[PDB]
Amino acid sequence: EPVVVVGAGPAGLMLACELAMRDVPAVLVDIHPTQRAEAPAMAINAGTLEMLDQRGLAAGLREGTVTFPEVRFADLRLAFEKVQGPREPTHMVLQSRLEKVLIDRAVELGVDLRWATRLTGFEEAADGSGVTVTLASDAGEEQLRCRYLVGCDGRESIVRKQAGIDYVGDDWVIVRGIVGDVAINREDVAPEQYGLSYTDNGDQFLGAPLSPDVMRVFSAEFSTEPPEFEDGPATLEQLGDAVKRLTGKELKATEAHWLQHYSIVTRNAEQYRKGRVFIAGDAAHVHYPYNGQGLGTAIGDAVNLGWKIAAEVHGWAPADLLDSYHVERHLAGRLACMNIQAQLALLYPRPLARYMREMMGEFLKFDEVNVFLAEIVTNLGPAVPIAYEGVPEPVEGDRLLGRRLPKVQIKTADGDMGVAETLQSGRGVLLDLSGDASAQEESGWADRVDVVRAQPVPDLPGTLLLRPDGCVAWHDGGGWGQDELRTALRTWFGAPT
Amino acid sequence: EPVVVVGAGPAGLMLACELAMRDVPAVLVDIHPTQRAEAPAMAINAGTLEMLDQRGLAAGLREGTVTFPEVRFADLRLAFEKVQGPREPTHMVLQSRLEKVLIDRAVELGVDLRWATRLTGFEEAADGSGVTVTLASDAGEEQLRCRYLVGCDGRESIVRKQAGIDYVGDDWVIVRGIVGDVAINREDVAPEQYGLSYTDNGDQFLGAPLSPDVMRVFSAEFSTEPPEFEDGPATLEQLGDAVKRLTGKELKATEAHWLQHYSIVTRNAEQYRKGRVFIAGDAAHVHYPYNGQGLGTAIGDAVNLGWKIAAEVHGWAPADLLDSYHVERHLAGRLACMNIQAQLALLYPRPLARYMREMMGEFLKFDEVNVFLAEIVTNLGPAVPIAYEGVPEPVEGDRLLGRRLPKVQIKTADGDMGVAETLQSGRGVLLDLSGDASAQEESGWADRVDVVRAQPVPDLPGTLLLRPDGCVAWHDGGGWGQDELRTALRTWFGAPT
Numbered sequence: 001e002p003v004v005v006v007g008a009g010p011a012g013l014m015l016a017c018e019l020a021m022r023d024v025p026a027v028l029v030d031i032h033p034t035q036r037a038e039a040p041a042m043a044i045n046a047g048t049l050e051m052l053d054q055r056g057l058a059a060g061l062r063e064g065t066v067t068f069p070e071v072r073f074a075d076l077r078l079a080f081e082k083v084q085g086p087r088e089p090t091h092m093v094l095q096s097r098l099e100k101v102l103i104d105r106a107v108e109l110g111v112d113l114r115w116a117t118r119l120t121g122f123e124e125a126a127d128g129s130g131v132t133v134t135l136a137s138d139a140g141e142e143q144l145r146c147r148y149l150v151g152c153d154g155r156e157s158i159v160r161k162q163a164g165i166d167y168v169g170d171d172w173v174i175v176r177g178i179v180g181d182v183a184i185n186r187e188d189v190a191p192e193q194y195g196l197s198y199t200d201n202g203d204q205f206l207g208a209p210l211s212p213d214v215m216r217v218f219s220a221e222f223s224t225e226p227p228e229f230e231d232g233p234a235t236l237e238q239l240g241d242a243v244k245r246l247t248g249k250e251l252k253a254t255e256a257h258w259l260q261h262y263s264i265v266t267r268n269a270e271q272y273r274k275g276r277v278f279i280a281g282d283a284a285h286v287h288y289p290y291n292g293q294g295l296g297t298a299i300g301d302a303v304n305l306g307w308k309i310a311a312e313v314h315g316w317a318p319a320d321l322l323d324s325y326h327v328e329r330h331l332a333g334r335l336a337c338m339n340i341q342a343q344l345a346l347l348y349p350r351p352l353a354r355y356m357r358e359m360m361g362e363f364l365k366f367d368e369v370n371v372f373l374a375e376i377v378t379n380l381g382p383a384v385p386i387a388y389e390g391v392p393e394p395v396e397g398d399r400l401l402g403r404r405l406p407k408v409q410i411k412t413a414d415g416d417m418g419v420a421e422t423l424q425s426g427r428g429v430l431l432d433l434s435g436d437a438s439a440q441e442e443s444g445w446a447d448r449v450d451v452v453r454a455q456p457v458p459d460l461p462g463t464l465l466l467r468p469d470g471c472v473a474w475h476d477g478g479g480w481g482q483d484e485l486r487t488a489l490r491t492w493f494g495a496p497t
Numbered sequence: 498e499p500v501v502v503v504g505a506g507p508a509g510l511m512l513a514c515e516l517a518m519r520d521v522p523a524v525l526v527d528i529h530p531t532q533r534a535e536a537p538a539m540a541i542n543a544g545t546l547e548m549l550d551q552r553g554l555a556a557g558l559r560e561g562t563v564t565f566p567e568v569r570f571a572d573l574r575l576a577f578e579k580v581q582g583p584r585e586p587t588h589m590v591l592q593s594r595l596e597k598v599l600i601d602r603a604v605e606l607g608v609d610l611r612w613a614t615r616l617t618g619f620e621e622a623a624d625g626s627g628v629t630v631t632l633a634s635d636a637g638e639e640q641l642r643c644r645y646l647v648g649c650d651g652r653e654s655i656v657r658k659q660a661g662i663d664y665v666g667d668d669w670v671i672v673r674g675i676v677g678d679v680a681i682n683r684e685d686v687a688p689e690q691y692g693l694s695y696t697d698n699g700d701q702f703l704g705a706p707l708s709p710d711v712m713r714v715f716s717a718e719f720s721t722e723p724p725e726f727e728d729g730p731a732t733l734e735q736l737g738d739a740v741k742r743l744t745g746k747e748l749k750a751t752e753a754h755w756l757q758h759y760s761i762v763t764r765n766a767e768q769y770r771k772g773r774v775f776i777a778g779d780a781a782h783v784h785y786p787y788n789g790q791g792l793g794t795a796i797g798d799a800v801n802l803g804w805k806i807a808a809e810v811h812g813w814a815p816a817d818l819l820d821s822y823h824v825e826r827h828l829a830g831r832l833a834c835m836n837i838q839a840q841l842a843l844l845y846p847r848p849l850a851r852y853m854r855e856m857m858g859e860f861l862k863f864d865e866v867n868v869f870l871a872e873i874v875t876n877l878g879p880a881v882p883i884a885y886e887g888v889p890e891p892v893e894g895d896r897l898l899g900r901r902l903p904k905v906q907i908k909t910a911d912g913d914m915g916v917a918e919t920l921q922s923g924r925g926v927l928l929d930l931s932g933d934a935s936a937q938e939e940s941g942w943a944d945r946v947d948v949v950r951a952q953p954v955p956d957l958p959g960t961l962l963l964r965p966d967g968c969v970a971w972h973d974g975g976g977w978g979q980d981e982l983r984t985a986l987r988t989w990f991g992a993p994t
């Protein structure tokens with residue numbers, strides 16, 4: 001019986017995929033007649049690449065795409081090379097190219113996607129075993145009965161609203177500006193300034209030439225006084241004042257494909273799950289767009305929740321399972337909101353930025369804060385907490401537990417392999433890196449866990465257990481072994497067959 | 498040929514002692530008729546205690562006074578137990594009690610101390626051979642010819658302004674309050690108003706009793722619009738009003754001995770020195786009063802600068818030694834201003850504080866952050882940078898170089914003492930902790946440096962060289978030896994004789 005997703009944005013597309021690949025029905029609604037043209041995001045950080053790699057959604061959208069190597073906290077530099085294991089630079093695949101990869105993958109799996117469809121209301125069952133939901137369409141109002149409802153519908157989520165869920169947060173300034181694309185003149189070399197510049201008050205402009213003709217525009221201006229223009233469709237010459245004030249120069253590039261005023265607000269819903277309803281992505285948290293974190297956490301919420309919903313659809317999910325979704329992702333929600341606000345504080349207000357910058361100068365000389373911030377801003381981090389009653393804590397400096405593996409090559413049967421492609425089935429993975437296949441395969445979970453035998457791998461333990469979202473749930477590099485291994489599968493994977 | 502010190506707070510008093518204990522003629526000018534009563538500070542931190550221990554001024558202030566062993570950042574806890582070596586809790590010593598012992602020490606060491614005397618100006622001679630100063634007593638105007646002019650005359654330093662050094666800083670909020678001592682019953686006419694009362698805005702109220710009839714009172718209020726009253730004498734009715742809104746009740750007020758309006762800005766002088774004119778304490782840097790840093794840096798300033806000036810007077814100072822006053826002490830002012838302001842940003846405004854508290858919450862899980870901040874707010878504080886030509890920077894992290902040693906016993910054949918006590922002669926110390934007098938003392942510097950032969954001390958190297966301000970300029974627990982020590986001696990104590 002169906003599961004309803006609202007929003008064909010990055011969070012909803014991925015989650016519908018996550019579901020359908022596990023043979024669970026999923027209907028995905030969206031107001032847009034077609035895939036939207038206003039996908040502002042351009043970047044994807046390493047953390048999000050690993051999650052796409054886990055579904056084979058990233059080979060291909062690497063290629064031709066160029067990468068940038070720094071990872072910055074405001075304009076300060078983080079020492080990303082201090083993160084454990086080999087990782088990835090941020091890649092420059094447009095959000096629209098990624099939404100389509102997710103669209104045409106969603107339906108190939110079997111997603112009932114409905115463009116031009118808005119959810120306008122929903123009601124829990126007095127039983128509680130379902131949620132009746134109503135949908136406005138060109139054809140008129142339908143009323144579908146679903147088994148779980150997930151609102152991936154952005155900052156103004158009605159799913160979040162009608163569910164009773166508070167949207168906590170606060171801002172001390174309002175950043176605002178415009179984002180979009182403008183034509184160029186072509187055959188002749190283009191001129192002007194366009195590299196991301198700052199002014200002495202925190203104001204930023206960036207011309208990003210996507211491709212010979214087309215260049216994306218972003219500006220960001222700080223002030224307490226409420227935005228002038230109420231966040232709509234803009235016009236090209238609201239924009240050209242925009243740059244002239246900030247740049248000094250004039251725009252001089254005709255026509256504007258799509259443009260969008262925006263304003264920021266920092267929010268993080270206090271509950272990610274109420275009963276049978278869930279919220280995810282910008283529906284659950286929103287903030288100034290830095291480091292690709294909004295797209296990072298959106299994809300990450302879906303991956304987290306998808307396999308967990310399927311698990312209880314097929315009746316093996318421990319009672320704990322779906323509550324762990326709120327636990328692990330409200331933490332990532334909190335850490336994202338937090339660090340982006342901390343980055344703003346180094347730009348505005350200028351009396352505050354002055355001392356916070358020096359402050360961060362002092363912290364960034366410490367290796368733990370460089371590594372902590374780097375895992376956070378690239379969505380490698382929030383390590384989902386891993387612990388089991390009774391079992392001895394793994395000694396001390398273990399940074400594999402509750403994280404996804406570095407981008408390391410696995411050598412198995414035939415064909416070397418990225419570690420994250422072992423999760424493309426959708427199941428758990430027990431990694432055996434002995435080189436001879438010695439580990440005891442606890443067969444009772446073989447329906448939900450795949451074993452993969454391979455040669456040992458530098459600074460990685462002899463064997464590892466992965467949840468279907470890729471988080472390392474067990475390994476034997478520390479004190480752990482087969483006994484701790486079992487209680488780890490009882491958790492996260494339920495009762496053995 | 499005198500040295501003129503303007504201002505008899507901690508800074509100027511402490512320096513006049515540093516100058517007079519070394520037989521440098523010092524004349525210390527203040528305008529008060531007697532020692533002031535407007536000395537609000539109730540606390541002395543561990544770094545200030547060590548610097549006073551170096552001159553026998555700490556014991557005596559310590560007996561009978563309370564300690565509390567928590568070092569806070571804003572209102573969070575700092576893991577002070579992670580700071581190297583044994584050290585001290587903050588002791589609750591009253592500013593006027595401290596100033597009294599330094600006025601005492603000054604008059605016996607022969608400082609010409611002048612209450613009711615104002616410095617109205619000064620000029621640097623064209624050649625530069627001296628400064629001529631002008632002092633304004635009731636009798637008239639002495640025009641005094643002196644050798645160096647040190648302005649320790651407080652936040653509104655005439656010396657700084659007339660020397661034309663810019664006073665750098667900014668604030669996003671203006672903190673205002675009043676402070677002083679009311680007379681007022683104690684038993685049960687202090688309710689809520691006992692101990693500090695952080696409220697549901699950044700605003701605090703501190704009520705601390707001295708004797709059962711007098712109480713010291715402190716208020717600190719955050720607002721985005723200028724202080725109602727100019728800084729100055731204030732009325733007790735004005736305090737009654739302020740207490741009611743903060744504590745919620747009213748103080749059964751009897752009489753006011755002294756109370757004062759205060760506002761807070763944050764500034765760091767750009768140059769603590771302009772050739773023959775130095776500045777120190779509040780004239781060099783000011784900020785919100787936290788952790789005792791205003792007092793620590795003030796005393797720290799004088800301990801650094803008295804001995805360098807004395808060396809120049811005595812003619813053995815190296816050429817670049819007084820320029821290290823600015824280098825060493827501007828950094829310490831920088832970092833005090835920086836982290837005070839950082840502490841304030843966990844209080845106000847409340848949107849900023851919301852996330853900056855979560856942020857610091859994450860950073861204080863790290864040892865290097867706890868130790869760095871705890872060191873600075875206790876004025877154990879900025880390690881003085883120690884490097885020498887030829888000598889290559891020692892790879893391992895050294896917690897002793899550039900810092901005053903931890904509170905350890907050192908046992909001599911003539912008796913035991915704490916290590917800060919060996920610097921009481923005013924001279925540098927060569928600590929030979931071998932137990933055998935195995936260290937080869939460079940007899941050249943025998944007149945500027947004392948050898949102290951003591952028993953080995955756990956977790957300290959076998960030999961150490963202390964500059965007259967207690968700072969470790971050399972030790973042999975890394976790779977350094979007799980040649981590096983000879984380098985250290987030339988750069989800090991000058992030519993060998």
Ligand SMILES: Cc1cc2nc3c(=O)[nH]c(=O)nc-3n(C[C@H](O)[C@H](O)[C@H](O)COP(=O)(O)OP(=O)(O)OC[C@H]3O[C@@H](n4cnc5c(N)ncnc54)[C@H](O)[C@@H]3O)c2cc1C
Nearest residue numbers: 007009010011030031041119153154281282289292294295
């Ligand atoms: C100017 C700007 C620049 C940005 N730059 C970046 C960047 O460089 N890198 C990055 O990672 N992130 C960036 N972001 C943020 C990032 O784009 C968002 O986090 C991400 O697109 C939101 O993920 P989402 O799918 O949950 O929300 P959305 O993108 O808002 O998708 C929600 C979808 O649900 C639709 N919907 C369908 N039906 C309904 C219904 N009944 N009710 C409500 N909605 C419905 C909505 O129309 C929408 O299409 C930027 C944001 C802005 C404003």
Ligand SMILES: Cc1cc2nc3c(=O)[nH]c(=O)nc-3n(C[C@H](O)[C@H](O)[C@H](O)COP(=O)(O)OP(=O)(O)OC[C@H]3O[C@@H](n4cnc5c(N)ncnc54)[C@H](O)[C@@H]3O)c2cc1C
Nearest residue numbers: 504506507508527528538616650651778779786789791792
């Ligand atoms: C409300 C308030 C609360 C405080 N709370 C604390 C606390 O909790 N803990 C702490 O450690 N410190 C506290 N302080 C003080 C802080 O430490 C100061 O930095 C320190 O007292 C300043 O020392 P100083 O000697 O450089 O300047 P000052 O103490 O200001 O002394 C300067 C002296 O020079 C005099 N003078 C000025 N101009 C002239 C002139 N031309 N000629 C002659 N004399 C002149 C002045 O009258 C004064 O006597 C507080 C101060 C205030 C106002």
